[PDB]
Amino acid sequence: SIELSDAVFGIEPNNSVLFEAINLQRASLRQGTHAVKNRSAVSGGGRKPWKQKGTGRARQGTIRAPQWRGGGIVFGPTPRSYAYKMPKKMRRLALRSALSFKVQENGLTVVDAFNFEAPKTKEFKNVLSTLEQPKKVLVVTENEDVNVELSARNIPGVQVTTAQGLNVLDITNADSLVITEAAAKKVEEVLG
Amino acid sequence: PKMKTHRGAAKRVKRTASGQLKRSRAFTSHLFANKSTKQKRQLRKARLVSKSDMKRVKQLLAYK
Amino acid sequence: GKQCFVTGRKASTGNRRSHALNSTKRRWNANLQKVRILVDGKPKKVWVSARALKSGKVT
Amino acid sequence: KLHELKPAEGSRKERNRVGRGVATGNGKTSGRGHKGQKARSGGGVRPGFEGGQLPLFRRLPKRGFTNINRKEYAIVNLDQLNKFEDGTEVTPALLVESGVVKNEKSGIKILGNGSLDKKLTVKAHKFSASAAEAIDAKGGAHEV
RNA sequence: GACAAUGGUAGGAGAGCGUUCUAAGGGCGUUGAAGCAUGAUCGUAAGGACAUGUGGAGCGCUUAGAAGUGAGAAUGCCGGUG
RNA sequence: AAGCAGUAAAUGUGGAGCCGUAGCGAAAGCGAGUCUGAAUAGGGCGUUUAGUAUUUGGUCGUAGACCCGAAACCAGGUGAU
RNA sequence: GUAGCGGCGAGCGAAACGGGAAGAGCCCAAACCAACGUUGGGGUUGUAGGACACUCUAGUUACAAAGGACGACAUUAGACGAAUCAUCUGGAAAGAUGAAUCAAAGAAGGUAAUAAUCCUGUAGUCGAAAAUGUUGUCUCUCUUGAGUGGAUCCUGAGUACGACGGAGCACGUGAAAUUCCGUCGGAAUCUGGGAGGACCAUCUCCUAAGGCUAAAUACUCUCUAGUGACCGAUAGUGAACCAGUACCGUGAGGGAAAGGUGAAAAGCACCCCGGAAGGGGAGUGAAAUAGAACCUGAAACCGUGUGCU
């Protein structure tokens, strides 16, 4: 079957918006979790090592100065978040470009509803090969699929998601997209 | 933290439509016998902050 | 220290300000007097403030 | 394709780093000049007063006061009302939902900058002298 | 292809090389990776390969991303050696 | 925007709020014009009125703020072998 | 970063409204009634409540008064758990080349080299004598609800408040309201009393001077299970190491340096020089210039030969 909306699948992709939407998602799961110590945090070094004058040595205040071995970092890492936000009218514009690009490259397959009621990985591998699908595929359905998401999750390169959980990065990564009839109708109304 | 505005400067100027500042006149406190009639009459008319002084205090009134 | 027996009168702390508004710490003691009052046992001399002495009190 | 990405031409640049070699032009002095107060670590003088000669906003006097009971109303010119159709009851409750007034501070005031060209009845808190004659000339009424 | 321009400190502006890590893609290696050593090699520069010895298990390349990203000197600090 | 929903997930929900569409005056106030003035008589500022949200780079402000270094001050303690 | 405060300098800096998380409110004094200043009943407020008068009708043991036998999960040991063989190079296969097989299991680590199918495991099911938790259904202990009623009573006293000297509210004594402390004066009793930024009048809202109260909030010496465009031995905690230890001070106190043989000790039997140490062979191993001062082994620097000078 061929069931398209002809509105959110036919627009031209916006490369400038599609690039800023991928950088936003990748930078949003970078938990910084990284910190070093400075002069105040290093243990010890509270007295002056030697008098300012009377010796042929340089003047030094603490054994934890940034030049001394074993203490003091000047400008190192610090715990911070990397996530930022973009307007709402640019989020939907980036999703339609990731969905229309697949259609332009001839990589969208509209399949009827699945009838998988028991988890079986060997059974799900057949329909992927029967439908002439590439190595990495994405599966989108209407709602949560028990006994379906349990399968196709041990196959290297197969990802199953929902209709409300589509991502700019999860879509651009797959070679082809496999969507059901009920799902393609749900995606056509949430977008555009 | 947020930037703090110059409270003393906010009591002496006001912003206009183009973006310039309206200022009062000095020498208007006392000693009016030492000045002439033409001098005191032309000191009631307000002026604007000059182009030079604007470059120094442009960020003291960011919220004004 | 010295504290009132009937109520909780005690000293406090403030500032001693001159004409130039110069700050210096100081104390404000209570008017504690030594009187002998009736007790369920033997009458005892205890520190009592002059505010509690007024309005009538046994001595 | 995540293996072929290109940003928009002219939107990205590389930051500047001072004190890294001499060929960059920002080497030893690092863009500060020679010795002075503006060359040490910790900035320089404050643009507010900077010491020295009497500052600017200390040589001019203060002026005026601030009213606490000050009232301010929104303004709807005439060229904004002509989007409605003839025979409509314009109401401060409708002007908000219509999308021409985002916030009513203490009421709506109808100014007369433009031309109405339409037949309406306008309700508002206050009116203007030239905005009350254009509503009634071509027909219509205004009610407070 | 014609004409003109190209000495430079403080300073302004533009274009590039290299180091570490992440993502996607695609490759190399016990028939010997990284590193270390030598050579008469290739680019306008920062720099890039190849062969031959030593080594005994990891590492490039392309496009983007993020920086504890470049050392000759501070009576600089620690180690080794005159 | 907090918040709720969701892998610490990048994502729908949430219009309290913020800027702009109109200025002028110390203010009452008036309004494409408003103040000064007995009087647009003249003059000052407006009739530019396409902005707004996120982000790369330059710079500024508050935080030690490009790095190293005093002679000093205060607070609580240790010492008459 | 608005109102406002401020040698109106530097600087300090709100609240209400609105949008959300969470959300039960109740006990004492007194008038009064039987008893001996005392026990119990009674009784708790502003759209004014109670005492008094007339007929009459759900335990919230986290506040609200507080003791006990009372079933399901959960914590503290664990048990099962699918699927590969062959041939080359090598000391050694997990690699390469061939055919195959599992998957609700392609997290991860080990194993003579790089393993979904070799070993511990993983997904998913099951399991508690005994102790401790979290949560219930009954039991046990408490326990009559509301209208009408001011002729007469009760509703917190050296208190409220004022002057004087200070402090605290964003607010520096200023026109300083609203809250506290020391000293001394010192009220009124529902026709009452307080507040609405000096103060008075009217008009609105609320009842001080007794006492309890769970949730949304802040933090981590710890326990358990996990993550990183975090470090990789001058780094990361001072400390990967038998470290607050050598060591240094009368003392309080101050404080380092030091990881790596090999897959496996299989750690060189015996012979030769030597008093020993250390070497030369022979052996072990894939490799001994991998021999415990043991992976790789840079520069400074110290040497032994030689081609030109």
Side-chain angles (χ1 to χ4, degrees):
Chain A
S1 51
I2 305 89
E3 274 302 324
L4 272 67
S5 70
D6 294 18
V8 309
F9 287 88
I11 68 152
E12 159 84 356
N14 199 337
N15 288 337
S16 315
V17 174
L18 191 58
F19 176 65
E20 280 281 72
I22 291 178
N23 260 29
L24 189 136
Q25 168 156 1
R26 259 194 71 206
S28 277
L29 54 84
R30 210 197 150 145
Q31 65 181 49
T33 68
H34 51 0
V36 293
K37 293 176 161 53
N38 64 334
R39 294 185 58 162
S40 158
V42 184
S43 177
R47 73 171 62 158
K48 190 171 183 156
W50 57 73
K51 317 162 298 182
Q52 195 157 28
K53 323 268 285 194
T55 178
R57 304 202 80 174
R59 41 195 195 190
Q60 298 300 346
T62 305
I63 66 171
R64 308 305 197 189
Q67 68 214 325
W68 281 62
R69 163 196 181 275
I73 317 296
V74 190
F75 292 125
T78 190
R80 65 187 152 145
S81 199
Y82 298 81
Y84 57 103
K85 310 191 74 57
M86 55 205 287
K88 287 167 183 166
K89 282 177 187 170
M90 288 170 63
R91 302 173 195 170
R92 275 194 318 276
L93 182 56
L95 272 162
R96 285 191 252 110
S97 316
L99 287 188
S100 89
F101 182 73
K102 293 297 172 194
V103 177
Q104 296 188 343
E105 300 289 42
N106 208 31
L108 187 56
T109 287
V110 193
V111 65
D112 210 359
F114 292 113
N115 302 327
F116 267 62
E117 74 172 347
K120 206 74 188 190
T121 317
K122 192 175 71 71
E123 186 80 24
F124 209 91
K125 198 80 201 305
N126 289 123
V127 285
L128 294 184
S129 182
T130 318
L131 295 172
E132 273 271 301
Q133 280 309 283
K135 164 70 155 38
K136 324 156 54 182
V137 307
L138 184 67
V139 182
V140 191
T141 328
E142 176 49 53
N143 304 132
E144 297 143 41
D145 293 330
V146 195
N147 314 337
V148 165
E149 74 167 324
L150 281 175
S151 316
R153 83 168 173 184
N154 211 14
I155 311 172
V158 176
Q159 195 57 72
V160 191
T161 175
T162 46
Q164 77 163 22
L166 284 188
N167 302 326
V168 180
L169 191 149
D170 195 2
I171 281 164
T172 303
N173 204 267
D175 313 278
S176 88
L177 183 46
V178 182
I179 49 180
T180 78
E181 193 208 320
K185 294 300 208 311
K186 185 91 160 294
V187 182
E188 88 181 342
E189 73 91 27
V190 293
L191 296 172
Chain B
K2 284 194 284 197
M3 202 158 57
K4 294 197 167 185
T5 176
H6 194 190
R7 301 302 302 176
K11 309 179 184 180
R12 296 168 164 89
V13 301
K14 54 190 272 182
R15 192 86 69 176
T16 61
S18 158
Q20 296 178 313
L21 290 175
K22 180 184 180 183
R23 71 170 184 85
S24 199
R25 304 302 298 273
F27 286 74
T28 65
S29 199
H30 50 64
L31 290 173
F32 294 103
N34 306 138
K35 325 170 194 297
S36 54
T37 318
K38 182 168 155 324
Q39 216 163 359
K40 295 183 301 187
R41 189 185 53 237
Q42 280 175 356
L43 277 170
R44 274 181 273 166
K45 295 297 171 301
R47 304 271 169 268
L48 280 84
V49 175
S50 88
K51 53 181 82 178
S52 312
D53 294 271
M54 190 82 57
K55 300 168 66 175
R56 177 173 47 237
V57 303
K58 63 165 302 298
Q59 213 183 46
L60 298 183
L61 297 149
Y63 293 113
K64 194 66 185 295
Chain C
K2 32 182 169 297
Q3 193 178 314
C4 203
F5 182 84
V6 169
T7 185
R9 292 288 160 86
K10 62 174 179 300
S12 78
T13 297
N15 290 327
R16 180 182 300 283
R17 293 213 169 276
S18 52
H19 179 260
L21 295 161
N22 274 129
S23 201
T24 317
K25 315 284 295 183
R26 68 161 286 199
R27 301 208 69 88
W28 316 68
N29 309 95
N31 194 22
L32 291 170
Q33 305 280 297
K34 180 69 77 70
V35 304
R36 169 201 75 259
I37 64 172
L38 199 159
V39 187
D40 66 328
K42 173 152 31 182
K44 194 193 311 184
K45 293 195 184 309
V46 284
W47 287 109
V48 190
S49 186
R51 197 73 153 172
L53 293 183
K54 80 183 307 186
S55 87
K57 195 181 184 293
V58 300
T59 55
Chain D
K1 298 309 183 187
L2 279 174
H3 42 103
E4 299 135 11
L5 288 173
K6 284 286 294 188
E9 272 284 358
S11 66
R12 290 302 192 99
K13 281 196 63 171
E14 190 204 310
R15 72 200 290 175
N16 169 250
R17 292 180 297 140
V18 306
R20 292 301 189 283
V22 76
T24 56
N26 270 359
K28 177 181 55 178
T29 44
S30 297
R32 277 181 186 257
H34 290 304
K35 300 167 311 190
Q37 196 186 359
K38 304 212 300 172
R40 326 281 171 185
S41 185
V45 307
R46 182 73 183 270
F49 64 102
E50 77 263 10
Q53 178 183 276
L54 195 74
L56 178 71
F57 301 125
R58 215 173 169 181
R59 214 164 43 241
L60 311 171
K62 311 185 301 194
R63 172 72 178 258
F65 77 108
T66 291
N67 195 333
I68 178 168
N69 295 346
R70 160 73 160 169
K71 297 131 202 162
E72 205 206 349
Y73 319 95
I75 57 170
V76 193
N77 285 293
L78 287 185
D79 215 357
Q80 302 176 359
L81 292 167
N82 65 71
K83 65 160 52 189
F84 299 90
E85 293 310 335
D86 303 0
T88 318
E89 183 48 86
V90 167
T91 301
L94 172 138
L95 284 172
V96 166
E97 314 182 75
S98 158
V100 74
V101 179
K102 209 66 150 61
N103 166 65
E104 50 173 359
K105 290 176 283 293
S106 51
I108 315 295
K109 172 158 192 182
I110 309 291
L111 301 186
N113 187 27
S115 316
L116 188 43
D117 293 330
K118 297 275 201 64
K119 272 278 281 193
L120 289 77
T121 182
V122 195
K123 292 177 40 80
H125 291 72
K126 288 181 62 178
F127 269 78
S128 277
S130 315
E133 60 95 19
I135 287 181
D136 303 5
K138 56 158 61 74
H142 58 296
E143 165 178 297
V144 297

